[PDB]
Amino acid sequence: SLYREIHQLISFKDVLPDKNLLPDWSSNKNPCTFDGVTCRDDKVTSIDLSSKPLNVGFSAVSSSLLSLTGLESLFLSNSHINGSVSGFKCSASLTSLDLSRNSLSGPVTTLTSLGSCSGLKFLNVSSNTLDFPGKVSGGLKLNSLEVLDLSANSISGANVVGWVLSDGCGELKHLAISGNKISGDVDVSRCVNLEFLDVSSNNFSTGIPFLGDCSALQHLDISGNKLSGDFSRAISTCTELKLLNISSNQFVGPIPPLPLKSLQYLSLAENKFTGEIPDFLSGACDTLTGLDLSGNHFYGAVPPFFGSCSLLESLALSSNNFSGELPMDTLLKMRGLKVLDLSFNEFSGELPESLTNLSASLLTLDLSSNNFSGPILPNLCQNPKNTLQELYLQNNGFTGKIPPTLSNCSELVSLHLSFNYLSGTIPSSLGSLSKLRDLKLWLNMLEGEIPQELMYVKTLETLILDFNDLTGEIPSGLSNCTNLNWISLSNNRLTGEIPKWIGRLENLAILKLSNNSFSGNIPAELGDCRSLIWLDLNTNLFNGTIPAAMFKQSGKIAANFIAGKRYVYIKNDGMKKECHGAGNLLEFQGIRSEQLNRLSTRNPCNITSRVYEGHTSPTFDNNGSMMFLDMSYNMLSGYIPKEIGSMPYLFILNLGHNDISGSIPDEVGDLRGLNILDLSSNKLDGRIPQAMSALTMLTEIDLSNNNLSGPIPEMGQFETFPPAKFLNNPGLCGYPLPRC
Amino acid sequence: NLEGDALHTLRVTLVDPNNVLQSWDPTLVNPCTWFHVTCNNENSVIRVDLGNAELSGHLVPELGVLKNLQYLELYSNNITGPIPSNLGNLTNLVSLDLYLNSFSGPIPESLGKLSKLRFLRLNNNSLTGSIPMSLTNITTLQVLDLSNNRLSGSVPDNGSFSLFTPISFANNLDLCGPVTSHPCP
Numbered sequence: 074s075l076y077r078e079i080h081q082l083i084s085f086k087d088v089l090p091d092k093n094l095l096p097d098w099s100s101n102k103n104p105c106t107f108d109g110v111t112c113r114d115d116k117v118t119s120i121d122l123s124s125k126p127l128n129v130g131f132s133a134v135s136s137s138l139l140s141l142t143g144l145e146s147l148f149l150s151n152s153h154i155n156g157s158v159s160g161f162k163c164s165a166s167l168t169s170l171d172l173s174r175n176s177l178s179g180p181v182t183t184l185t186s187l188g189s190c191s192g193l194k195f196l197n198v199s200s201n202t203l204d205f206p207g208k209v210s211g212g213l214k215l216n217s218l219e220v221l222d223l224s225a226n227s228i229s230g231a232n233v234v235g236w237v238l239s240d241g242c243g244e245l246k247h248l249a250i251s252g253n254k255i256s257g258d259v260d261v262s263r264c265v266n267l268e269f270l271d272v273s274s275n276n277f278s279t280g281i282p283f284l285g286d287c288s289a290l291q292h293l294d295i296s297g298n299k300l301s302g303d304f305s306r307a308i309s310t311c312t313e314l315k316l317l318n319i320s321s322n323q324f325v326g327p328i329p330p331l332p333l334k335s336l337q338y339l340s341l342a343e344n345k346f347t348g349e350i351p352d353f354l355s356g357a358c359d360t361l362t363g364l365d366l367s368g369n370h371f372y373g374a375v376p377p378f379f380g381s382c383s384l385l386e387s388l389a390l391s392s393n394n395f396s397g398e399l400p401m402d403t404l405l406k407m408r409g410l411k412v413l414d415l416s417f418n419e420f421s422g423e424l425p426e427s428l429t430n431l432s433a434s435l436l437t438l439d440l441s442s443n444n445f446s447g448p449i450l451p452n453l454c455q456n457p458k459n460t461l462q463e464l465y466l467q468n469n470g471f472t473g474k475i476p477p478t479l480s481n482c483s484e485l486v487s488l489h490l491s492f493n494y495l496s497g498t499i500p501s502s503l504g505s506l507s508k509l510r511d512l513k514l515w516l517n518m519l520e521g522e523i524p525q526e527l528m529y530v531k532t533l534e535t536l537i538l539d540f541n542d543l544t545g546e547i548p549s550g551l552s553n554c555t556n557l558n559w560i561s562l563s564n565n566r567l568t569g570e571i572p573k574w575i576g577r578l579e580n581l582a583i584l585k586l587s588n589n590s591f592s593g594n595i596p597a598e599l600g601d602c603r604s605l606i607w608l609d610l611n612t613n614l615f616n617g618t619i620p621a622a623m624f625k626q627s628g629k630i631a632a633n634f635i636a637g638k639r640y641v642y643i644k645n646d647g648m649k650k651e652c653h654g655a656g657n658l659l660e661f662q663g664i665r666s667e668q669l670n671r672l673s674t675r676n677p678c679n680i681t682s683r684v685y686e687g688h689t690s691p692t693f694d695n696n697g698s699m700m701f702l703d704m705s706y707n708m709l710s711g712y713i714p715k716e717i718g719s720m721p722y723l724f725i726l727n728l729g730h731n732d733i734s735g736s737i738p739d740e741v742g743d744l745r746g747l748n749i750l751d752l753s754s755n756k757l758d759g760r761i762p763q764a765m766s767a768l769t770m771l772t773e774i775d776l777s778n779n780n781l782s783g784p785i786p787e788m789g790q791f792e793t794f795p796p797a798k799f800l801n802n803p804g805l806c807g808y809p810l811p812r813c
Numbered sequence: 814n815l816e817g818d819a820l821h822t823l824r825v826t827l828v829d830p831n832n833v834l835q836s837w838d839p840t841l842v843n844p845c846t847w848f849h850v851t852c853n854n855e856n857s858v859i860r861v862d863l864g865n866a867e868l869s870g871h872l873v874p875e876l877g878v879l880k881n882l883q884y885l886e887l888y889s890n891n892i893t894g895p896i897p898s899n900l901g902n903l904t905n906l907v908s909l910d911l912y913l914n915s916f917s918g919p920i921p922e923s924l925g926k927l928s929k930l931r932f933l934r935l936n937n938n939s940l941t942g943s944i945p946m947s948l949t950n951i952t953t954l955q956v957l958d959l960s961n962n963r964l965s966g967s968v969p970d971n972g973s974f975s976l977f978t979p980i981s982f983a984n985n986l987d988l989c990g991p992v993t994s995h996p997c998p
C-alpha cells in the first residue's frame with residue numbers, strides 16, 4: 074500500500090506543468106507527513122489539494138489518486154483541473170469527493186461513470202463548465218448519493234432532474250442544481266429523505282415542483298424563476314419546514330396558508346403578491362427568525378400580533394405601498410430585532426420619542442423614501458452602548474437641524490441624511506465617529522463651513538455633500554483620509570483653490586466639483602491618483618492652463634474598490650444654456666426617482682429627457698484610464714498638450730465654453746471610447762486632424778465657436794454630425810459644412 | 814416595450830465580444846435609455862448607432878417594426894447574412910450605412926418603399942444581384958456608395974440614380990450602363 078501510495082502520489086506530481094508544486098512531496102519521505110494529506114495509521118484516508126492551482130487534467134487524477142485503496146475523501150476545489158470524467162478504477166472506501174470550482178467540461182452524462190465508487194456518498198461538482206447537449210434520456214444512475222451539488226454550470230435543458238433521479242432519490246438528503254437554465258417539472262416525491270433543495274436561478278416557466286409527502290424536507294429554494302400557481306397546497310404536506318425562498322417569481326394573489334410550525338426563514342419577496350400581512354402568520358412566532366416581503370403591492374400596517382415573536386432578527390417591508398404611523402409598541406415587543414428596513418414606502422408622521430431606545434438594539438434602521446415629516450430626534454443615542462450601524466433617513470420631509478447627539482452612536486458605519494429639507498450647519502462633533510464609512514448629506518439647506526475635525530476619520534470612504542448652500546473653502550485635514558473613494562460636492566457656494574494634496578489618496582475614484590466658485594489652477598498632482606476614473610469640474614472660476622502630466626497615471630488605473638454603489642447620471646441637453654456641463658453624477662442609494670422633482674428649485678432641467686440609472690461598474694478592474702472628464706464653462710487657457718489622447722477608456726470629454734487656444738492634437742484620434750465631445754466656445758485654431766476620423770464611438774459632438782480652419786474630415790463619423798455643431802468656424806469647410 | 818423586445822431579439826442574434834449590448838435590458842419600460850440608442854420626444858426609437866462595435870452574426874427582420882426610426886449606422890463590422898426583405902416597412906429611415914462588412918444576399922426589393930431615404934452606403938460588402946429599379950422611385954436619394962462589391966447587371970441612369978458617379982459603382986463584378994465605364998451589350 075504505502076509503496077504504491079507514495080509512488081502514485083509522485084507519479085501524479087510528475088504531470089504538473091509547475092515543477093515545484095508540492096513542497097513536501099518526495100520519495101524517501103512518509104506520505105503521511107505531506108501537506109494537504111491527512112494519513113491515519115500509516116494508511117491514507119484523506120487528501121486536500123483545495124485552492125492549489127495544479128493546472129492539470131482530470132484524467133491524470135482518476136488513474137493515480139482515485140485508485141488509492143482506503144482513501145475516503147479528496148478535495149480538489151479551485152485546483153484548476155480541466156478535462157472530463159472517464160471510466161476508471163475507484164476504491165469502495167471513497168466517501169466524499171469535491172471537484173467544485175474547476176474547469177471540468179463536456180456533457181453531464183459523463184458523471185454516470187462515477188458509479189465505479191461503491192461507497193460514494195458526497196459529491197460536489199458545483200461551479201464547473203459541464204453542460205447537457207440535446208435530449209435527456211436514461212439516467213444518472215447514481216442512487217447512492219446523499220448529497221449532490223450541480224450548482225453554477227452551463228446546463229441548459231428540461232426535466233434534467235428526472236434524468237438525475239432516474240435511478241431513484243431514495244438515499245438523497247441534499248440537492249443543489251442552481252445557477253443553470255432548467256425548465257419543466259420537478260418530481261422529488263420518490264425521495265422521502267431529502268432535507269435540502271436549491272433549484273434557484275433557472276428557466277422554469279411551469280408549475281412548482283412535486284414534493285409528494287414532503288415529510289423530511291427542511292429547505293426549499295425555488296427563487297430566480299418564472300414560476301406561477303399555488304405553492305401553498307403543494308407545501309401543505311410539509312410538516313417540518315424551515316427555510317423557504319420563493320423570491321423573484323411570478324406568483325400572484327394574497328398570501329395563502331403555510332406550514333408555520335417549524336418555519337425559520339420566509340421570503341415571499343419580489344413578487345406580484347397583493348393585500349396585506351395575514352393574521353395566521355402569528356402562528357410561526359415561536360420560531361421565525363427573519364422575514365422578507367419586499368417588492369410587492371402590499372399596503373396597510375404591520376400586524377401587532379408580531380409582538381408575540383421575540384425571535385425576529387430581521388424585518389424587511391421595503392419596496393411597497395405601506396403607510397401609517399410607527400407601531401413602536403409592537404416593535405419594542407421584539408427583543409431580537411436587528412435590521413429594520415422600511416424603505417420605499419408611504420409612511421408618514423413625526424418621530425416617536427421612544428425610538429431613542431432602539432439605538433441600543435437595532436443594527437440597521439432604514440426609514441428612507443417615505444412621506445415622513447418632523448425633526449430629527451436630539452435625544453437619540455442617549456442610552457449607553459449604542460449599537461446602531463447603518464442609518465438611512467433619506468428622501469423625507471424632515472425639518473429642523475442636525476443634532477450633534479449622533480456622535481453618541483459610536484458604532485455607526487453609515488449615515489444617509491440626504492434628500493431632505495434639513496437646515497442648520499454641520500457639527501464638527503461628527504469627526505468623533507471613527508467607524509463611519511458612508512456619509513451622505515446631499516440635497517439640503519445646510520449652511521456653514523466644513524469641519525476640520527473630519528480629518529480624524531481615516532475610514533471615510535464616500536462623502537456626498539452635493540446640492541447644498543455650504544460656503545467656505547476645503548479643509549486641508551481632509552487629506553488625512555486615505556480611504557476616500559468618492560468625493561462629490563456640487564451646486565454649492567464653496568470657494569477657494571483646489572487642494573494639491575489629492576495625490577495622497579490612492580483610493581479615490583470620483584471627484585465632482587460642479588457648479589461652484591472654486592478658482593485657481595487645476596493641479597498636476599491629480600496624476601498621482603491611481604483610482605480616479607471620474608472628474609466633473611464644469612462650472613467654476615478656475616484660471617490658468619491645462620497640464621499634460623495629469624494623464625500620466627492613465628493605464629495604471631485600478632478602480633476595484635469603487636464598484637458596488639448606486640448612481641444616477643443626468644444628461645445635460647444642450648437646448649437650455651442655463652444647465653451646464655455634460656451631466657451630473659449623483660449617489661442615488663435609498664432614493665426614489667419620482668421625487669427627483671425636488672430638484673426643480675435647484676436646477677433648470679426638464680422637457681422630460683433624459684435620466685440614466687445604475688450601480689457603479691468600472692470598465693476595468695486594473696490598469697485602466699479616466700472614464701469621464703468635464704471642464705466645460707471655465708476660464709482655462711493655453712494650448713492642449715498631446716497627452717489629451719492617452720485615455721482610450723474615456724467615454725465623454727467636455728472642455729466647452731473656455732479660453733483654450735491652440736491646435737487640436739492628432740492624438741485625439743487615439744480615443745476609441747469617446748461617445749460625446751464638446752469643445753464648443755474656445756479659441757482653438759488650425760485644422761481638424763485627419764486622425765480624428767479614427768473615432769467611431771462618438772454619438773455626439775460640438776465643435777462650434779472656435780478658430781478652427783480647413784476641410785472637415787470626410788471619413789469617420791464627422792459626416793453623421795450636423796453643421797449646427799460646426800457653427801462659428803470661419804475657415805472651416807467640407808461636409809457637413811459647405812464644400813470648399 | 815415592443816421596440817425593446819425587437820432590439821433585444823437583435824441583441825440575441827448578434828455576436829458581441831465587447832458586450833456593447835450588455836446595457837440593453839428587456840425588462841425596461843423602453844429601449845430609449847439604452848446606449849447608442851436614441852429616442853424622440855414621443856419616446857420611440859429614432860436612432861440606433863452600433864457602428865464599429867466589432868460584432869458578428871446576422872440581423873433580424875424585427876428592425877422593420879420601428880416606424881419613427883431615422884438613423885441606422887451598422888458600419889465597420891464582420892457582420893454576415895442577408896439584408897431583410899421587410900426593411901421596406903421603415904418609412905422614416907433617412908440614413909442606412911452598412912459599409913465595411915460581410916453582409917450577403919441580393920439588394921432587397923422593398924427598399925423601394927423608403928420614401929425619405931437620403932443616405933445609403935453599402936460599400937465594401939459582399940452583396941450580389943441586380944440593383945432594384947424601385948429605388949428610382951426614391952427621389953430623396955443623395956449619397957450612395959456601392960463600390961468594391963460583387964453586384965452585377967445594368968445600372969439605371971434614371972430617377973435619383975442620375976445623381977451618381979462611377980466611383981460609387983466602381984470595383985464591382987460586372988456592371989453596365991451609362992453610369993458605369995463599362996457598356997451594356
Ligand SMILES: *[C@@H]1O[C@H](CO)[C@@H](O[C@@H]2O[C@H](CO)[C@@H](O[C@@H]3O[C@H](CO)[C@@H](O[C@H]4O[C@H](CO)[C@@H](O)[C@H](O)[C@@H]4O)[C@H](O[C@H]4O[C@H](CO)[C@@H](O)[C@H](O)[C@@H]4O)[C@@H]3O)[C@H](O)[C@H]2NC(C)=O)[C@H](O)[C@H]1NC(C)=O
Pocket residue numbers: 564565588612651652653673674675676677
Ligand atoms: C448652481 O446652483 C445654483 C443653486 O443651486 C443654481 O441657482 C438656482 O437655479 C434655480 C433654477 O433656475 C433657481 O430656481 C428658481 O428660483 C426662483 C427664485 O429665485 C423661482 O422663482 C420664484 O420661486 C419662488 C419659490 O417658488 C417664489 O417664492 C418667488 O416669487 C420666485 O419669483 C423659480 O421658479 C421657477 O421654477 C419653478 C419650478 O422650477 C416654476 O414653477 C416657476 O413658475 C418658475 O418658472 C426657480 O425655481 C434658483 O433660484 C437659483 N438660485 C440661485 C441662488 O441663483 C444655478 O442655476 C446652478 N448653476 C448651474 C450651471 O447648474
Ligand SMILES: *[C@@H]1O[C@H](CO)[C@@H](O[C@@H]2O[C@H](CO)[C@@H](O[C@@H]3O[C@H](CO)[C@@H](O)[C@H](O[C@H]4O[C@H](CO)[C@@H](O)[C@H](O)[C@@H]4O)[C@@H]3O)[C@H](O)[C@H]2NC(C)=O)[C@H](O)[C@H]1NC(C)=O
Pocket residue numbers: 150173174197198199200220222247
Ligand atoms: C459545494 O462547493 C461549493 C464551492 O465551494 C460550496 O459553495 C461555497 O460554500 C462555502 C462554504 O464552505 C461558502 O463560503 C462561505 O461564504 C460566506 C459568504 O456567504 C462566508 O461568510 C463564509 O465565511 C465563514 O466561513 C469561513 C470558513 O469557511 C470562515 O473563515 C469565516 O470567518 C466565516 O466563518 C464562508 O467562507 C461559499 O460562499 C460558497 N460559494 C462559493 C464558493 O461560490 C458549497 O457549499 C458546496 N456544497 C456543500 C453541500 O457543501
Ligand SMILES: CC(C)[C@H](C)[C@@H](O)[C@H](O)[C@@H](C)[C@H]1CC[C@H]2[C@@H]3COC(=O)[C@H]4C[C@H](O)[C@H](O)C[C@]4(C)[C@H]3CC[C@]12C
Pocket residue numbers: 606607640642644685687688689690691692700724725748749772846847848849850
Ligand atoms: C463606472 C461608473 C463610475 C459609471 C457611473 C458607469 O457605471 C456608468 O454607467 C457610465 C459608464 C455610463 C453612465 C452614463 C452613460 C452615458 C449616458 O449618457 C449618454 O447620453 C449616453 C448616450 C448614448 O446612449 C451613448 O451610447 C452612451 C452614453 C454617452 C452613455 C456612456 C456611458 C455612461 C457614461
Ligand SMILES: *[C@@H]1O[C@H](CO)[C@@H](O[C@@H]2O[C@H](CO)[C@@H](O)[C@H](O)[C@H]2NC(C)=O)[C@H](O)[C@H]1NC(C)=O
Pocket residue numbers: 273274296297318319320321338340
Ligand atoms: C432569496 O432568494 C434570492 C433570489 O436569488 C437570493 O438572492 C439574493 O438577493 C438578490 C436577489 O434580488 C441577489 O442579487 C443577491 O445576490 C442575493 N443575496 C445574497 C446575500 O446572496 C437570496 O439570497 C435568498 N435569500 C436567502 C436568505 O438565501
Ligand SMILES: *[C@@H]1O[C@H](CO)[C@@H](O)[C@H](O)[C@H]1NC(C)=O
Pocket residue numbers: 129130155156178
Ligand atoms: C487541459 O489543459 C491543457 C493544458 O495546456 C490543454 O492542452 C488542454 O486543451 C486542456 N483541456 C481542455 C478540455 O481545455
Ligand SMILES: *[C@@H]1O[C@H](CO)[C@@H](O)[C@H](O)[C@H]1NC(C)=O
Pocket residue numbers: 593594616617618
Ligand atoms: C490666474 O489668474 C490670476 C489673475 O487673475 C493670476 O494672478 C495667476 O497667476 C493666474 N495663474 C496662472 C498660472 O497664470
Ligand SMILES: *[C@@H]1O[C@H](CO)[C@@H](O)[C@H](O)[C@H]1NC(C)=O
Pocket residue numbers: 890891
Ligand atoms: C473581422 O475583422 C476584424 C478586424 O476588423 C478581424 O480582427 C477579425 O479576425 C475578422 N473576423 C474574422 C472572423 O476573421
Ligand SMILES: *[C@@H]1O[C@H](CO)[C@@H](O)[C@H](O)[C@H]1NC(C)=O
Pocket residue numbers: 913936937960961962984
Ligand atoms: C473596399 O474594398 C476594396 C477592394 O474590394 C479594398 O481595396 C478597400 O481597401 C476597401 N475599403 C476599405 C475602407 O477597406
